[model samples]
Target chain A: SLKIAAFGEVMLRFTPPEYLMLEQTEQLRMNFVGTGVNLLANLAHFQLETALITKLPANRLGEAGKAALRKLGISDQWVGEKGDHIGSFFAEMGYGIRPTQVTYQNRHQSAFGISEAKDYDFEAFLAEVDMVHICGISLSLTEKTRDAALILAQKAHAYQKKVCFDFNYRPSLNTANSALFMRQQYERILPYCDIVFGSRRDLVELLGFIPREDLEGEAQETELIQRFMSQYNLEWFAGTTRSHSQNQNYLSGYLYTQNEYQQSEKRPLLNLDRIGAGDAYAAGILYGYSQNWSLEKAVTFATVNGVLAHTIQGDIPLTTVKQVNHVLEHPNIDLIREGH
Target chain B: SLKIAAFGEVMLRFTPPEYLMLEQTEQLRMNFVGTGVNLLANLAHFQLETALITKLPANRLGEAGKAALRKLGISDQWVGEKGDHIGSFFAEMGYGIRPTQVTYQNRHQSAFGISEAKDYDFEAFLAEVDMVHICGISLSLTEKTRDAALILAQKAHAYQKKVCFDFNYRPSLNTANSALFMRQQYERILPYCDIVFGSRRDLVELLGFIPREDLEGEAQETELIQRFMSQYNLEWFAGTTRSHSQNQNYLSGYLYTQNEYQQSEKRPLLNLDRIGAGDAYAAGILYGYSQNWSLEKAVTFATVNGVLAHTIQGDIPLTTVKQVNHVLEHPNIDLIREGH
Candidate 1:
């Protein structure tokens, strides 16, 4: 019966209808999403009590964004009604070898765009929530949000609350940070994190880990996760690998704890929209961890969640616990089914 | 029953989810539409037999676009499977006094974007249809479609089939021709038009009409229609007037015949998207005209269709003849109705 809350700026996403490129269409399919809140949304959909702490304007567009979150069963009481616009981005979905591209226009506006740690009462915010989630993409948005992310993690640790961080890095946000600068931010926040989600590549690039080229596959995975987990005192760690082909991908997930690595079976997906698969994978692990599931079961649940995320569109996991459990139990069931 | 067909490039339109500007969102709602084919769609909704004559790429996007048209009951026999991309435009729908702005990325691509009149067999294209429709916007899209529009109109007239023309002048497409050059194209095509739709401003600006500034209202309507009819030998001439407010407007329509002008009663519309109001107006006129309804009834039907277009979202009219007639007969009915 624990409550979960997330901190980040929710953005409006405009995509060309169908498979048309950004430059190919005049009309775009609209959706509101953010890496920080999508996890909270998935948690809410699993029947967990969840809320979002953010800022949105009081305008019609802002009202619609608020309504979208409310519809997802996420409480918006902590969302301040200020700011001129919502943080927004344009996504052109690609096919085959062409990867999906996102262009961000999320600067100098929106509630969180101008929000700082001082704008929130951390004690009151953490008092009502058992767990809080933050992401590197949220940290990269602005100095204020970055400070807010770091402060939230620090305060959550101080308040004896569970802290989860997703290493969702963006190169566009690098203008404000050097490789070592981001590594410093990660270093400051890592000690506060109970669970961490990031790839070995992210660790090498963001945290300055020089991987041994001689060690490959499981040996490499163990080296990366164990090094970071021991250094940061991270209680749990998880990562995923994706093999891309012409129109499909084979994906796998791995979890680590106490110097042991548990990997899940590879699942192949066709015509997958891989935008939010990683987020959903991380959400699955947290969902299991919050429920005190065994590490093996948690990795299995996370792997199924990631595969299901590719089956649906958009950057949020709208899957329920029942659906995830069904897939986890029936590993041989068709991944592409009706009403799923 | 006369068969109807339309020729134009149907494009994808992207708008902000709500009132957010194009840059304000990461997602956009998608619709497949064109001034030329939208008329055919509305006509089909009225239970008219219709088809579309154009070219679309043979890709997934093109297939989806084709499926959309087929779902609308418009045949795709003339929609050749050629070209690499579909012509598309970006429409940022405006609120209040602000107008909807469109950025067209439809250039040097798609079938009609680079097509020439020689690319189509006009005889085979028009053979199965009793009447064909064309628009100035389609002509304005590219030199090829412009030539196609002229050829279709001329061929339709030569084959003794009805040619319906909507003066959908686009200022952005003016680079291909000067004011006088477009006027000459209109002069060549107008003589072949059996039914024509254009605003008084369009007539004055495109055709170089020296309207008497002293004349106002019905007198002005008669002057514009009469001058065009006498010069081009038009069978019927129709036009509309809109009085816009914050988000609502008053709309009226006028139809002209042999030495007589018939004006319809004004109707007020709330929250109207007037992007394709004119095309819907012309569709209504043609809908009634195809059925040989009296000029008064046709004008009434056309005016109501124009007003109803403002009531719906997007550029295509999804209204049925029953809805248009209901409004025409019951002008005093509540303007705001449910599930319209």
Candidate 2:
């Protein structure tokens, strides 16, 4: 059995049931989530062996996040205490003409400024682990975190385990970048990776490869994935293509591996909560890789997992493996996708 | 036992702390509150025999509000459900140089849009109740709610119960002089009221009594109370004043009855989470009246209760009877308030 390990910050995802603005919402639907933690949750929900590494305050919210990991079947054995303030984001679903907005508020958080990673027992954390899934989001936290992440990636490579990196950049915030400098930082750990997943543009800028302007947004999915794989020197690569129409609710996406691509039929959800469809896709793909699924199969499963999430409310859809597969089978579902 | 029944819509209060502009607040403190429920909670906290009449969705938020009431020892036998939406509000707290702002979203609320009072077995709801407190906040919801509120108010009065009305006009949003319109619509119930409370300007405008323009801003507690006493033909009148200082800490207040005016020293608090200071003052006064305290003692208790509420973290203070009395006696409480 392949052991899985995921590392990142966990955040409290506070969302109003539907497209209600902060002023209009009476009560928010809440979930505790983070990229690495979410991937662990997805894998566990699929009955896979997984371990989550994260720092949390020893407060009620921290305990709640740890309990959530337990429910998802992810062992919280690698958990460490920082301080009480948990990271969080407020998400509002967008209706007809409005776009969904997710505002992050995890700055200067306990986990962000802490430098306790040197004391971390990575050997125990990776004991029998087959893969380590980390992402670019953590690198933007601080120099110490970046250093620690690089060390962790190097350690995984030394132990003959695969390392996966997701280039989930936030260029719009001006705080994140898709620049060569940022890519150079990410590429430093790429030689230690077996597979890496990112959107087409992320791979281009992060790998200092050909820019997307040359394609005029008309590039084929398989072609884009192939280009990304070769450019990043990764054995396996996957990417997602989104077709945005009107609102966040009126969108569809497809997944493509270097050799194959699977697309979902047009799906218009009644409510689109949060802007984590990309993160959800990454989680599904990571879960599939840990299960030793074929590259093509992993891409298809990843897209469908994201589709199921779009149907459900909140960032991390509280769903089962059977539920995700069921949606994959029923490609022609007519659920209005009303968030509430 | 004077059975005191209160009815009004509760709004989720979202307020930006520390005099920050609505746009500037990255994180606003939240509190689930309703005008009628706030009173019931205070009355219950003060050990008054009170019953609450309100509507909430049959969901977790509703359950949360009910739990708050039950914890305060209020009889929750009268809460009903009728609408799909809960009332909400966004507010900005103003300090010495800052001015407060509030946006009410009470339209289409379950309690407001629902038709009819649903005929509470007043015999069951007010088994031994002597008073019913209804405020104009419900009137601002909709005409349906305004009428329904009047029906319930009349029913209680017809059954020989004392009636209390607060001219809670929304000058900015609800331009209608509801206090005046209520005089005609709720006239049948006015005869049964032992007391009526309203500002001098509000009473003259609503009751069509002798009018004076300049007293609007200059009226003192003694002068203001006397004006309402004669203008609204109120058996008793009460008024409150606040002096705000920026440090997010110090504030002073005074409340007056027909006989005496009581002043609270510069009470310091750290966080003033929400608005509705006036409602809290009135509720505390109601509780003191139920306790049969002297008028001066009752007004003083109300002032202290309001001050303690500023020190609390939530919309309403979860204070015990001992704590309320301590503030009233301390006379020199210089402790900093904690959450706003």
Candidate 3:
């Protein structure tokens, strides 16, 4: 059995439009979501022995965060409990033509820059782990957690461990090296990565590049990714294309690799709870890596994973490989996929 | 213009039997309830304009505490919110014979003891105040709040303001040096007290004198109280007593004063909520003092306050003084009293 690991901050997300004054809002609908937590949650949904490592405050919100991971079968044996209250995001969930508005507070809390590696022993933590996946979002919090991520990455590389990275750019952070100065901060781990992932816009803005349109069909997506690979002289790159139509009724996802290109059929997802498709796709690739699946099959699985995400609740879809394959086979999906 | 000031710690109380685990429970229910806040709430419920001077942590609970006060029409301009998180008590409310249980934890919290004279200046805060009340429980938290209480008493005395003290003994805090220490603590400001109050047991325990129970009727309640006063070598002392019966038809209250003793009729309180009756009695006494009523009339009013408290929810009775006075005059008091 393969084990997966992810590291980042988890937040207690509170949402919905203001039905009353700020103080009059009695009960907020809360969700537990964070970039790293979402990725691990997706892996857990696929019945992978995924583990999420982060510090949670010894309070109700923190307890909820840990409880959520446990509910989804994500291991938290090494997670720290006794920091500030879990950070929360208040947002108006978007629907139809309206875009959601969000209010973010208390991001620079104790959990954002907690003390590192005191109780958690990395050697024992990764003893039986087959793959380790972390992202830039964890590094965006502060220097301490950022360095902790790097230390884990360096240790994983030293042990010849297969690793994956996401350029999870978040503007809420104040990275001293700047977004364009990504090469300076992540240089040590980038070349050491076995498989790396990124968004076209984030890479263009953070690591310096622009997408090209000359290549045709699936190669168009691959050609766009190769531009960044050639510039950085990097190996093992994966990129995803986002086609946002009027609604989920006409949403399509495509994946590009270093040599091969794969495009998924335009499957109409009736209603998307959120834009959690990318994380679901990443989870599929991780599952593919563990099974040693062919690149074409891997990318196809990743596409359907993205499609299934639109039907699930929360930022990360807790959909299994079977669920994604089922959706891919049965293209005629409904608003409510009942009788599953 | 009667302005009353109160100094104590305002906790964010959560009520139960809540869905909290045994390890999570520090008290019975969840909701913030401190002695001083309870006293202020009682006074406010009686239509007396009172101000609360207490410290609350600068968090959501603190905000809720302020809102709780404000919702009851109590002024909180002088209340302080600057500590970490408000201290909370979990309480399990009981019915019939089962007594309500409270589990206290983290009594040594920052807000309970951290504020200084500058943080809550009694002279400035009580500029327009007529009376101030301090409870013995405030002295149990830490030395700073205890000293602050003393300073507040002294300030009220210097300004010729009426001061009231309640010797509400907390058994958990009773120790070898407790009585001697409490006596010394109360002695500094006792000379300035216009009205001091305590129960028969509290007086006996604190002043080392037992009341004579042989003296019957008016003389018994009076003589017991006078010996109580002489034991402390004090004037203008007061207390309330409750006599329980098997049925809900025979519960009655009595009051003891320096000059007179008044025993209320056997007025049953159906479905009585135990906690806030004493504070309600103090509020009735303060109301009577503001009106310059006779000692007997004041005791009668205090008795009615306690009786009315049982009809309301939680500790703070929802009934008005007019209703309490109505209960005193009505032949069938239960019929006259409305239940929530």
**Each prediction's Cα lDDT score?**
0.78, 0.64, 0.66
Candidate 3 lDDT by residue in tens digits, B147-208: 88888877887887778888767656589688778767766666666677677666557656
Q: What order do you get sorting by lDDT, best first? A: 1, 3, 2
Q: TM-score of model 1 relative to the true fold? A: 0.54
Worst 10 residues of 3 chain B by lDDT: B21-30
Clashes of each: 22, 11, 21
Per candidate, native contacts kept equal: 0.26, 0.00, 0.00
Quote the lDDT for B296 in model 2. Answer: 67
In order of TM-score, best first, we have 3, 1, 2
Task: State the lDDT of candidate 1 residue by residue for B247-317, as single tens digits.
Answer: 55678888887588888877776654777777888888898888899889888888878878877888888
Model 1 misplaced stretches (Cα beyond 4 Å)? A1-340, B171-177, B212-221, B244-248, B331-340
Q: What would the TM-scores of all predictions be?
A: 0.54, 0.51, 0.63
Rank candidates, DockQ, best first: 1, 3, 2
Q: Write the per-residue lDDT of candidate 2 for residues A1-340, one digit (tens) a residue.
A: 5677876777766676556765554455556677777677767777778887778776544665778778668898888877555655567678766777665543444453464468568887776688888766667666766777788888998887888877766556544343656677787877776667666666554555564454644364356566666655576665565566644443344555455555545554444443555566777777776677766667667766676666666656556666677667875675635568
Distance from true position, residue B226, model 3, in Å? Answer: 9.6
Per-residue lDDT, model 2, residue B308, is: 68
Model 2, stretches more than 4 Å misplaced? A175-181, A211-228, A244-271, A330-340, B1-29, B32-340
**Chain B only, TM-score of each candidate:** 0.90, 0.77, 0.84
